[PDB]
Amino acid sequence: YEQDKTYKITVLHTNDHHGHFWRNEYGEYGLAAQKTLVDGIRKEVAAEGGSVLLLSGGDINTGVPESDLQDAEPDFRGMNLVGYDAMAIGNHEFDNPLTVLRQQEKWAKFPLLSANIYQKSTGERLFKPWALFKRQDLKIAVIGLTTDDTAKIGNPEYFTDIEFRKPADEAKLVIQELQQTEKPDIIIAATHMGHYDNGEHGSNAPGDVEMARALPAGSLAMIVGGHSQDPVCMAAENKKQVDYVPGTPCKPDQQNGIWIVQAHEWGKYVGRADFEFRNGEMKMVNYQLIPVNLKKKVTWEDGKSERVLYTPEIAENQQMISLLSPFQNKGKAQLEVKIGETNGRLEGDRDKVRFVQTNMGRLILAAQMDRTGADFAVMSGGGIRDSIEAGDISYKNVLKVQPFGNVVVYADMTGKEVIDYLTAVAQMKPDSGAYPQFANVSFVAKDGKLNDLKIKGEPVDPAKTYRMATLNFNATGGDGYPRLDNKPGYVNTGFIDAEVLKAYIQKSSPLDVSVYEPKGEVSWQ
Ligand SMILES: Nc1ncnc2c1ncn2[C@@H]1O[C@H](CO)[C@@H](O)[C@H]1O
Ligand SMILES: [Mn+2]
Ligand SMILES: [Mn+2]
């Protein structure tokens, strides 16, 4: 570089897009608004002589029907128009077969990066480990890393010949290689690993903090993350603010000299890290999370309430709208067809389905047993992606709750196998996607044993067999559930979760929430 010269670098970032290419019902976020905000930042940055690097922390796939139904094509194309420079491959990029991810890479005009994903049979990387950028006299390298929890929590069949090596360990190797061969002035890691206060990842694979702490001091200017889906704004050292408020200051985390940032989720913010480089020192001169048309609720004493923007409205870029419109409208009428109605809200929020039994769980499972003639049922709470509210229900509503495209399957097992299976599944505690959801089952589980085990209300008869219904995911060992696909009575019906659910609600409508209310038949202790 040039001695005594000050260089300006602005790093913009988003992560966990999850198919939100379109603004939401309240006019929030969307890529058309993101386009405008970023074009605007590019102009200010260029007028000052700096350069912009726009990075994604991954998890573009799954989360909005119109996106899901089309393999996030609208999302990846929108990203080309916004002008992303690189992206870290996220675990949900493995929600579809690999050919889908390969098609997404063909769509993306920016590289999809990951240094630690390897093909088992060859010991070679499935993706590029980094991209290089030459800006003025500087060379910037961006490494990509993917959480090694990807296969552990994902569809077993996709990973038979794929391994996710430890991200932190790969990061050590890649950085050293870069320093030895490319000699970048700055290295940034885009990662899909998670920010856990003080490195307290608990049950989750270790993420950004632990990695920053294990790498050589200042070896990365910053880590642009994702996965945990948090706005990384510190309330105190090693403690993120809870209920971060859009528009307020956001102090990014810094560990072992390495900044760590995250822009929450779904295009809600575009983070902006403003750096100055001079004679080797990298100074972050400003950091903020820019809300993309986020709104708050204001409530008047007359009881009326309305949605008000935190910051000046950002206009939707029309070229983006023109690009995304066809994808947004493809089959709209169908998705929005009324298929039924519910007495009340069907609890489907992670905080619930991941910790306690809920009626959405009873509902989905009811749909599944009914279609399979099953006596009892179970699914991963991590399979319930959304709740359903009182009122009409559209197919779109359902594709929002179950977006993975899982298949409903059943197993006819001896009461013997039943107890053994339920005992196993019951061993997975709350705060996990592997958490269980039950229907027509009950017990007083204790110390790993199943006390007072029953199916529908009658104890388990070892001699008698029973039919259990679930998804292929769980049946194949997803969330580490006991493999059912390679044992005695097992059947894959081919019926897609969403479809089975749609059908079941069309015929069972009007839905009476009281019928699906858990009463504590499952308890543990
Ligand atoms: N391909 C998939 N099919 C079904 N459920 C999935 C899939 N990938 C992840 N999940 C669910 O999401 C959780 C992680 O958010 C997993 O523990 C699992 O319950
Ligand atoms: Mn995510
Ligand atoms: Mn993720």
Coordinates of C-alpha atoms and ligand atoms in Angstrom, one line a residue:
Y1 CA 0.0 0.0 0.0
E2 CA 1.0 3.7 -0.1
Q3 CA 2.7 4.9 3.1
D4 CA 0.6 7.4 5.1
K5 CA -2.4 7.0 2.7
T6 CA -5.8 6.5 4.2
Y7 CA -8.1 4.0 2.5
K8 CA -11.8 3.9 3.0
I9 CA -13.6 0.6 3.0
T10 CA -17.3 0.1 3.7
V11 CA -18.6 -3.4 4.3
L12 CA -22.3 -4.0 4.0
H13 CA -24.0 -7.2 5.1
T14 CA -27.2 -9.2 5.5
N15 CA -27.8 -12.9 6.4
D16 CA -30.6 -15.4 6.8
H17 CA -32.6 -13.9 4.0
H18 CA -34.9 -17.0 3.9
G19 CA -36.8 -16.2 0.8
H20 CA -37.9 -12.7 1.7
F21 CA -37.3 -11.1 -1.7
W22 CA -40.7 -9.3 -1.3
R23 CA -41.7 -6.7 1.2
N24 CA -44.0 -8.1 3.9
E25 CA -47.7 -7.3 4.4
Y26 CA -46.8 -4.2 6.4
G27 CA -44.5 -2.7 3.7
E28 CA -41.3 -3.9 5.5
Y29 CA -38.0 -5.0 4.0
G30 CA -37.8 -6.7 0.6
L31 CA -35.0 -6.6 -1.9
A32 CA -36.5 -3.7 -4.0
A33 CA -36.1 -1.5 -0.9
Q34 CA -32.7 -3.1 -0.2
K35 CA -31.7 -2.2 -3.7
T36 CA -32.4 1.5 -3.1
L37 CA -30.7 1.7 0.2
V38 CA -27.5 0.0 -1.1
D39 CA -27.3 2.0 -4.4
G40 CA -27.6 5.0 -2.2
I41 CA -24.7 3.9 0.1
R42 CA -22.6 3.1 -2.9
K43 CA -23.0 6.7 -4.1
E44 CA -22.0 8.2 -0.8
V45 CA -19.1 5.8 -0.4
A46 CA -17.8 6.5 -3.9
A47 CA -18.1 10.2 -3.5
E48 CA -15.7 9.9 -0.6
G49 CA -13.3 7.7 -2.5
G50 CA -14.0 4.5 -0.6
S51 CA -15.1 1.1 -1.9
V52 CA -18.0 -1.1 -0.9
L53 CA -18.0 -4.7 -0.2
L54 CA -21.5 -6.3 0.2
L55 CA -21.6 -9.7 1.9
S56 CA -24.2 -12.3 2.8
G57 CA -24.0 -14.6 5.8
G58 CA -26.2 -17.2 4.0
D59 CA -29.4 -19.1 4.6
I60 CA -31.1 -17.6 1.5
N61 CA -33.3 -20.7 1.0
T62 CA -36.6 -21.6 2.7
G63 CA -39.1 -19.4 4.5
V64 CA -41.6 -17.8 2.1
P65 CA -43.7 -20.1 -0.2
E66 CA -43.3 -18.1 -3.4
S67 CA -39.6 -18.3 -2.9
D68 CA -39.5 -21.9 -1.7
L69 CA -41.7 -23.1 -4.6
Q70 CA -39.2 -21.7 -6.9
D71 CA -35.9 -22.6 -5.3
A72 CA -35.2 -19.0 -4.3
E73 CA -34.6 -18.0 -7.9
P74 CA -36.2 -14.6 -7.3
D75 CA -33.9 -14.2 -4.2
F76 CA -30.6 -15.0 -5.9
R77 CA -31.5 -12.8 -8.9
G78 CA -32.5 -10.0 -6.7
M79 CA -29.1 -10.4 -4.9
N80 CA -27.4 -10.0 -8.3
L81 CA -29.3 -6.7 -8.8
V82 CA -28.5 -5.5 -5.3
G83 CA -25.0 -6.4 -6.2
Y84 CA -23.7 -8.8 -3.5
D85 CA -20.0 -9.5 -3.8
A86 CA -19.9 -12.9 -2.0
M87 CA -21.9 -15.1 0.3
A88 CA -21.2 -17.7 2.9
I89 CA -23.0 -21.0 2.2
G90 CA -25.6 -21.5 4.9
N91 CA -27.1 -24.8 6.2
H92 CA -30.4 -24.2 4.6
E93 CA -28.6 -24.1 1.2
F94 CA -28.8 -27.9 1.8
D95 CA -32.6 -28.0 2.2
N96 CA -32.8 -29.0 -1.5
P97 CA -30.8 -31.6 -3.4
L98 CA -27.3 -30.5 -4.3
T99 CA -28.2 -29.9 -8.0
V100 CA -30.5 -27.1 -6.7
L101 CA -27.6 -25.4 -4.9
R102 CA -25.5 -25.8 -8.1
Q103 CA -28.3 -24.1 -10.1
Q104 CA -28.4 -21.3 -7.5
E105 CA -24.6 -20.9 -8.0
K106 CA -25.2 -20.6 -11.7
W107 CA -27.9 -17.9 -11.0
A108 CA -25.6 -16.0 -8.5
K109 CA -23.2 -13.6 -10.1
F110 CA -21.3 -13.6 -6.9
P111 CA -19.5 -16.6 -5.4
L112 CA -21.2 -18.9 -2.9
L113 CA -18.4 -19.6 -0.5
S114 CA -17.4 -22.3 2.0
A115 CA -13.9 -23.5 2.9
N116 CA -14.9 -26.3 5.2
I117 CA -17.4 -28.5 3.3
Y118 CA -15.8 -31.5 1.8
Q119 CA -16.8 -34.4 -0.4
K120 CA -16.0 -37.5 1.8
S121 CA -15.0 -39.8 -1.1
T122 CA -12.4 -37.3 -2.3
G123 CA -11.3 -35.1 0.5
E124 CA -11.7 -32.2 -1.8
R125 CA -13.8 -29.0 -1.3
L126 CA -17.2 -28.8 -2.9
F127 CA -16.9 -24.9 -3.0
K128 CA -14.4 -22.1 -3.4
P129 CA -12.9 -21.3 0.0
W130 CA -12.5 -17.5 -0.6
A131 CA -12.8 -14.7 -3.1
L132 CA -10.2 -11.9 -3.6
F133 CA -10.9 -8.3 -4.3
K134 CA -8.4 -5.7 -5.4
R135 CA -9.5 -2.2 -4.3
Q136 CA -7.1 0.6 -5.1
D137 CA -3.7 -0.5 -3.6
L138 CA -5.3 -3.1 -1.3
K139 CA -6.2 -6.7 -1.6
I140 CA -9.1 -8.0 0.3
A141 CA -9.8 -11.7 0.8
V142 CA -13.2 -13.0 2.0
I143 CA -13.3 -16.5 3.3
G144 CA -16.6 -18.4 3.7
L145 CA -17.4 -20.9 6.4
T146 CA -20.4 -23.0 7.1
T147 CA -21.6 -24.4 10.5
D148 CA -20.7 -28.1 11.0
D149 CA -24.1 -28.6 12.5
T150 CA -25.4 -28.6 8.9
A151 CA -25.5 -32.4 8.5
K152 CA -26.2 -33.0 12.2
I153 CA -29.5 -31.2 11.9
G154 CA -30.3 -31.6 8.2
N155 CA -31.7 -34.2 5.9
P156 CA -29.5 -37.3 6.3
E157 CA -29.8 -38.4 2.7
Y158 CA -28.1 -35.2 1.3
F159 CA -24.9 -35.7 3.2
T160 CA -23.9 -39.3 2.6
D161 CA -20.8 -38.2 0.8
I162 CA -20.5 -34.7 2.3
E163 CA -18.6 -33.6 5.4
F164 CA -18.6 -30.3 7.2
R165 CA -15.2 -30.0 8.8
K166 CA -14.7 -27.7 11.9
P167 CA -15.0 -24.1 10.6
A168 CA -12.6 -22.7 13.2
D169 CA -9.9 -25.3 12.3
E170 CA -10.4 -24.7 8.6
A171 CA -10.2 -20.9 9.2
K172 CA -6.8 -21.4 10.8
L173 CA -5.5 -23.2 7.7
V174 CA -7.1 -20.9 5.1
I175 CA -5.8 -17.7 6.7
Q176 CA -2.3 -19.1 7.1
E177 CA -2.4 -20.1 3.4
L178 CA -3.6 -16.6 2.4
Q179 CA -1.0 -14.8 4.4
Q180 CA 1.7 -17.1 2.9
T181 CA 0.5 -17.0 -0.8
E182 CA -1.9 -14.1 -1.4
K183 CA -0.7 -11.7 1.3
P184 CA -4.0 -9.8 1.6
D185 CA -4.0 -6.5 3.4
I186 CA -7.4 -7.4 4.9
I187 CA -9.2 -10.7 5.4
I188 CA -12.9 -10.9 6.3
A189 CA -14.7 -14.1 7.0
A190 CA -18.4 -14.4 5.9
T191 CA -19.8 -17.2 8.0
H192 CA -22.9 -19.0 8.7
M193 CA -22.0 -20.1 12.2
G194 CA -23.8 -18.1 14.9
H195 CA -23.1 -15.5 17.4
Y196 CA -23.5 -16.7 21.0
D197 CA -22.9 -14.4 23.9
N198 CA -19.4 -15.0 25.3
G199 CA -19.1 -18.1 23.1
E200 CA -21.9 -19.8 25.1
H201 CA -23.1 -22.0 22.2
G202 CA -24.4 -24.6 24.5
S203 CA -25.9 -27.4 22.4
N204 CA -25.1 -25.6 19.1
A205 CA -21.9 -26.2 17.2
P206 CA -19.3 -23.5 18.2
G207 CA -19.7 -20.3 16.2
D208 CA -18.1 -16.9 15.6
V209 CA -16.9 -15.9 19.1
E210 CA -15.2 -19.2 19.8
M211 CA -13.6 -19.0 16.4
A212 CA -12.4 -15.4 16.8
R213 CA -10.9 -16.4 20.2
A214 CA -9.0 -19.4 18.7
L215 CA -7.5 -17.6 15.7
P216 CA -4.3 -15.5 15.8
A217 CA -4.9 -11.9 17.1
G218 CA -6.2 -9.5 14.5
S219 CA -5.9 -12.2 11.9
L220 CA -9.3 -11.2 10.5
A221 CA -10.5 -7.7 10.3
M222 CA -14.0 -8.9 10.9
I223 CA -16.4 -11.8 10.8
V224 CA -19.7 -11.2 8.9
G225 CA -22.1 -13.8 10.3
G226 CA -25.5 -15.4 10.4
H227 CA -27.4 -18.5 11.5
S228 CA -28.2 -17.5 15.0
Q229 CA -30.3 -14.8 13.5
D230 CA -29.4 -11.9 15.7
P231 CA -28.7 -8.2 15.3
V232 CA -25.2 -8.3 17.0
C233 CA -25.4 -5.1 19.0
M234 CA -23.8 -5.4 22.4
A235 CA -25.4 -4.3 25.7
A236 CA -22.3 -5.1 27.6
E237 CA -19.1 -6.9 26.8
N238 CA -20.1 -10.4 25.8
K239 CA -23.8 -9.8 26.1
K240 CA -26.0 -8.9 23.2
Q241 CA -28.9 -6.5 23.7
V242 CA -32.2 -8.4 24.1
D243 CA -35.0 -6.7 22.1
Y244 CA -32.6 -4.6 20.1
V245 CA -34.6 -1.6 18.8
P246 CA -34.4 -0.7 15.0
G247 CA -32.8 2.8 14.5
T248 CA -30.8 2.8 17.8
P249 CA -27.0 2.4 18.1
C250 CA -25.6 -0.9 17.4
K251 CA -22.2 -1.7 18.9
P252 CA -20.8 -4.8 17.1
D253 CA -19.0 -7.5 19.1
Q254 CA -15.2 -7.5 19.1
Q255 CA -13.3 -10.6 20.1
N256 CA -9.5 -11.1 20.1
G257 CA -9.3 -7.9 18.0
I258 CA -11.8 -9.2 15.4
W259 CA -15.1 -7.5 14.9
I260 CA -18.2 -9.7 14.7
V261 CA -21.4 -8.6 13.1
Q262 CA -24.8 -9.9 12.2
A263 CA -27.8 -8.2 10.6
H264 CA -30.5 -10.3 12.2
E265 CA -32.7 -11.8 9.4
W266 CA -34.9 -11.6 6.4
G267 CA -33.5 -8.4 4.9
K268 CA -34.6 -6.5 7.9
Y269 CA -31.4 -4.6 8.1
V270 CA -28.3 -3.9 6.0
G271 CA -25.4 -3.7 8.4
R272 CA -22.8 -1.1 7.5
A273 CA -19.2 -1.2 8.8
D274 CA -17.2 1.8 7.9
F275 CA -13.4 1.2 8.0
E276 CA -10.3 3.3 7.4
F277 CA -7.0 1.6 6.7
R278 CA -3.7 3.4 7.0
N279 CA -0.2 2.0 7.3
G280 CA -1.5 -1.3 8.4
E281 CA -4.0 -0.3 11.0
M282 CA -7.7 -1.1 10.3
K283 CA -10.0 1.2 12.2
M284 CA -13.7 0.8 12.3
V285 CA -14.9 4.4 12.3
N286 CA -18.6 3.6 12.3
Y287 CA -21.0 0.7 12.5
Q288 CA -24.8 0.7 12.3
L289 CA -27.6 -1.6 11.3
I290 CA -29.8 0.2 8.8
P291 CA -33.5 -0.8 9.1
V292 CA -35.1 -1.5 5.8
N293 CA -38.5 0.1 6.2
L294 CA -39.0 -1.6 9.6
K295 CA -42.1 -0.3 11.4
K296 CA -43.3 -0.1 15.0
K297 CA -46.8 -0.1 16.4
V298 CA -48.1 3.1 17.9
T299 CA -51.3 2.8 19.8
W300 CA -53.7 5.7 20.4
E301 CA -55.8 6.0 23.6
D302 CA -58.9 5.5 21.4
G303 CA -57.4 2.0 21.0
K304 CA -56.6 2.3 17.3
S305 CA -53.1 1.4 16.5
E306 CA -51.0 1.9 13.3
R307 CA -47.6 0.9 11.9
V308 CA -45.1 3.7 11.7
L309 CA -41.6 3.6 10.1
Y310 CA -38.6 3.9 12.4
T311 CA -36.7 5.8 9.8
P312 CA -37.5 7.7 6.5
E313 CA -39.2 5.4 4.1
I314 CA -36.9 3.8 1.5
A315 CA -38.5 3.7 -2.0
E316 CA -38.7 0.4 -3.8
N317 CA -36.4 0.2 -6.8
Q318 CA -38.7 -0.4 -9.8
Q319 CA -36.2 -2.4 -11.8
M320 CA -36.0 -4.7 -8.8
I321 CA -39.8 -4.8 -8.6
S322 CA -40.0 -5.5 -12.4
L323 CA -37.5 -8.4 -11.9
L324 CA -39.3 -9.9 -8.9
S325 CA -43.0 -9.4 -9.9
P326 CA -43.4 -12.5 -12.1
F327 CA -41.9 -14.6 -9.3
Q328 CA -44.1 -12.9 -6.7
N329 CA -47.3 -13.5 -8.7
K330 CA -46.6 -17.0 -10.2
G331 CA -49.7 -18.9 -9.0
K332 CA -50.8 -16.3 -6.5
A333 CA -54.5 -17.1 -6.8
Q334 CA -53.8 -20.8 -5.9
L335 CA -51.6 -20.1 -2.9
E336 CA -54.2 -17.6 -1.5
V337 CA -57.2 -19.9 -2.0
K338 CA -59.2 -20.4 1.2
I339 CA -59.0 -24.0 2.2
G340 CA -60.4 -23.8 5.7
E341 CA -60.8 -21.8 8.9
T342 CA -59.6 -22.2 12.5
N343 CA -61.4 -21.5 15.8
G344 CA -58.2 -19.8 17.0
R345 CA -54.5 -19.4 16.7
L346 CA -52.5 -22.6 16.1
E347 CA -49.3 -22.2 18.2
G348 CA -46.4 -22.7 15.9
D349 CA -43.6 -20.4 17.1
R350 CA -40.1 -22.0 17.7
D351 CA -40.0 -20.7 21.3
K352 CA -43.0 -23.1 21.8
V353 CA -42.7 -26.0 19.4
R354 CA -39.1 -26.3 20.5
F355 CA -39.9 -26.4 24.2
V356 CA -43.5 -27.5 24.8
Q357 CA -46.3 -29.4 23.1
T358 CA -48.7 -27.2 21.0
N359 CA -51.9 -27.5 19.0
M360 CA -50.2 -26.9 15.6
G361 CA -48.2 -30.0 16.5
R362 CA -51.4 -31.9 17.3
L363 CA -52.9 -30.6 14.1
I364 CA -50.1 -31.5 11.7
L365 CA -49.8 -34.9 13.5
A366 CA -53.6 -35.3 13.3
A367 CA -53.3 -34.8 9.6
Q368 CA -50.5 -37.3 9.4
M369 CA -52.1 -40.1 11.4
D370 CA -55.5 -39.7 9.6
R371 CA -53.8 -40.1 6.3
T372 CA -51.8 -43.1 7.4
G373 CA -54.3 -44.9 9.7
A374 CA -51.7 -44.4 12.5
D375 CA -52.4 -44.9 16.1
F376 CA -49.9 -42.3 17.4
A377 CA -47.7 -39.6 15.9
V378 CA -44.5 -37.4 16.4
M379 CA -42.5 -34.9 14.5
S380 CA -39.6 -32.5 15.2
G381 CA -40.6 -29.2 16.7
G382 CA -37.9 -27.9 14.4
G383 CA -40.3 -29.0 11.7
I384 CA -43.0 -26.5 12.7
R385 CA -41.8 -23.3 11.0
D386 CA -44.8 -21.2 11.7
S387 CA -48.0 -20.5 13.6
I388 CA -51.5 -20.1 12.1
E389 CA -54.0 -17.5 13.3
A390 CA -57.7 -17.4 13.9
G391 CA -59.5 -16.9 10.6
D392 CA -59.3 -18.4 7.1
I393 CA -56.5 -20.7 6.1
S394 CA -54.9 -20.7 2.7
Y395 CA -52.5 -23.2 1.2
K396 CA -49.8 -20.5 1.4
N397 CA -50.5 -20.5 5.2
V398 CA -49.6 -24.1 5.3
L399 CA -46.5 -24.0 3.2
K400 CA -45.3 -21.4 5.7
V401 CA -45.7 -23.9 8.6
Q402 CA -44.2 -26.8 6.7
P403 CA -41.7 -25.6 4.0
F404 CA -39.2 -28.4 3.8
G405 CA -41.2 -30.6 1.5
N406 CA -40.9 -33.6 3.9
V407 CA -42.7 -36.9 3.1
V408 CA -45.2 -38.5 5.5
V409 CA -44.3 -42.1 6.4
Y410 CA -45.3 -44.7 8.9
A411 CA -44.0 -47.7 10.7
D412 CA -45.8 -50.7 12.0
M413 CA -43.9 -51.8 15.1
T414 CA -44.3 -54.3 18.0
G415 CA -45.3 -52.7 21.3
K416 CA -41.7 -53.6 22.1
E417 CA -40.2 -51.4 19.4
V418 CA -42.7 -48.7 20.3
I419 CA -41.6 -48.3 23.9
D420 CA -37.9 -48.5 22.8
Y421 CA -38.5 -45.9 20.1
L422 CA -40.5 -43.5 22.3
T423 CA -38.0 -43.9 25.1
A424 CA -35.3 -42.9 22.7
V425 CA -37.1 -39.9 21.3
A426 CA -38.2 -38.7 24.7
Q427 CA -34.4 -38.4 25.5
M428 CA -34.1 -35.2 23.5
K429 CA -34.8 -32.1 25.6
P430 CA -36.3 -28.7 24.8
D431 CA -34.5 -25.8 23.1
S432 CA -33.7 -28.2 20.2
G433 CA -35.3 -28.7 16.8
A434 CA -35.1 -32.4 17.7
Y435 CA -37.5 -31.7 20.5
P436 CA -40.4 -34.0 20.1
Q437 CA -44.1 -33.3 19.3
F438 CA -46.6 -35.9 20.2
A439 CA -50.2 -36.9 19.4
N440 CA -52.2 -39.8 20.9
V441 CA -49.4 -40.6 23.3
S442 CA -48.7 -40.1 27.0
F443 CA -46.3 -41.0 29.7
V444 CA -44.7 -40.0 33.0
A445 CA -41.1 -40.3 31.7
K446 CA -38.4 -40.1 34.3
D447 CA -34.7 -40.9 34.6
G448 CA -34.5 -41.9 30.9
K449 CA -37.3 -44.5 31.5
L450 CA -40.9 -44.3 30.3
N451 CA -43.2 -44.7 33.3
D452 CA -46.9 -45.2 32.6
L453 CA -46.4 -45.4 28.8
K454 CA -49.6 -45.4 26.7
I455 CA -51.0 -45.0 23.1
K456 CA -54.3 -43.2 22.9
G457 CA -55.0 -44.0 26.5
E458 CA -54.2 -47.8 26.8
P459 CA -50.8 -49.1 27.9
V460 CA -48.4 -50.6 25.3
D461 CA -49.0 -54.3 24.7
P462 CA -45.6 -55.8 23.7
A463 CA -47.4 -58.5 21.6
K464 CA -49.7 -56.0 19.8
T465 CA -48.2 -53.9 17.1
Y466 CA -49.0 -50.2 16.4
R467 CA -48.7 -47.8 13.5
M468 CA -46.8 -44.6 14.1
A469 CA -46.7 -41.7 11.6
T470 CA -43.9 -39.2 11.0
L471 CA -41.8 -37.6 8.3
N472 CA -39.1 -39.3 6.2
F473 CA -36.7 -36.7 7.8
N474 CA -37.2 -38.1 11.2
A475 CA -37.6 -41.6 9.9
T476 CA -34.2 -41.5 8.3
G477 CA -32.5 -40.2 11.4
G478 CA -32.9 -36.5 11.1
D479 CA -32.2 -34.9 14.5
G480 CA -30.6 -38.2 15.3
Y481 CA -34.0 -40.0 15.6
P482 CA -34.0 -43.8 15.5
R483 CA -33.7 -45.0 11.9
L484 CA -37.0 -46.4 10.9
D485 CA -36.4 -46.6 7.1
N486 CA -34.1 -49.7 7.5
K487 CA -36.2 -51.6 10.0
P488 CA -39.2 -54.0 10.0
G489 CA -42.5 -52.2 9.3
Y490 CA -41.6 -49.0 7.5
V491 CA -43.5 -47.3 4.7
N492 CA -42.9 -44.1 2.8
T493 CA -46.2 -42.8 1.3
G494 CA -44.7 -40.2 -0.9
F495 CA -47.3 -37.6 0.3
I496 CA -45.8 -34.2 0.9
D497 CA -46.2 -32.8 4.4
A498 CA -48.0 -29.6 3.2
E499 CA -50.3 -31.5 0.9
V500 CA -51.4 -34.0 3.6
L501 CA -52.0 -31.0 5.9
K502 CA -53.9 -29.0 3.3
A503 CA -56.2 -32.0 2.5
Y504 CA -56.7 -32.7 6.2
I505 CA -57.8 -29.1 6.9
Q506 CA -60.0 -28.9 3.8
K507 CA -62.1 -31.8 4.9
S508 CA -61.9 -31.1 8.7
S509 CA -63.0 -27.5 8.3
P510 CA -64.2 -25.6 10.4
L511 CA -61.2 -26.2 12.7
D512 CA -62.1 -26.3 16.4
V513 CA -58.9 -25.4 18.3
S514 CA -60.2 -26.9 21.5
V515 CA -60.0 -30.3 19.9
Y516 CA -56.2 -30.0 19.5
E517 CA -55.3 -28.5 22.9
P518 CA -52.6 -30.5 24.7
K519 CA -53.5 -31.5 28.3
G520 CA -50.2 -32.8 29.6
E521 CA -50.3 -36.4 28.6
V522 CA -46.6 -36.0 27.9
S523 CA -44.5 -34.7 30.8
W524 CA -41.2 -36.3 31.8
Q525 CA -39.7 -34.7 35.0
Ligands
LIG1 N1 -34.4 -30.8 5.4 C1 -35.1 -30.7 6.5 N2 -36.3 -31.3 6.6 C2 -37.0 -31.3 7.7 N3 -36.7 -30.6 8.8 C3 -35.5 -29.9 8.7 C4 -34.7 -29.9 7.6 N4 -33.6 -29.2 7.9 C5 -33.7 -28.8 9.1 N5 -34.9 -29.2 9.7 C6 -35.4 -28.9 11.0 O1 -35.0 -27.6 11.4 C7 -34.2 -27.7 12.6 C8 -33.1 -26.7 12.6 O2 -33.7 -25.4 12.5 C9 -33.7 -29.2 12.6 O3 -33.4 -29.6 13.9 C10 -34.9 -29.9 12.0 O4 -35.9 -30.1 13.1
MN2 MN -31.4 -19.0 9.2
MN3 MN -28.8 -21.5 9.5

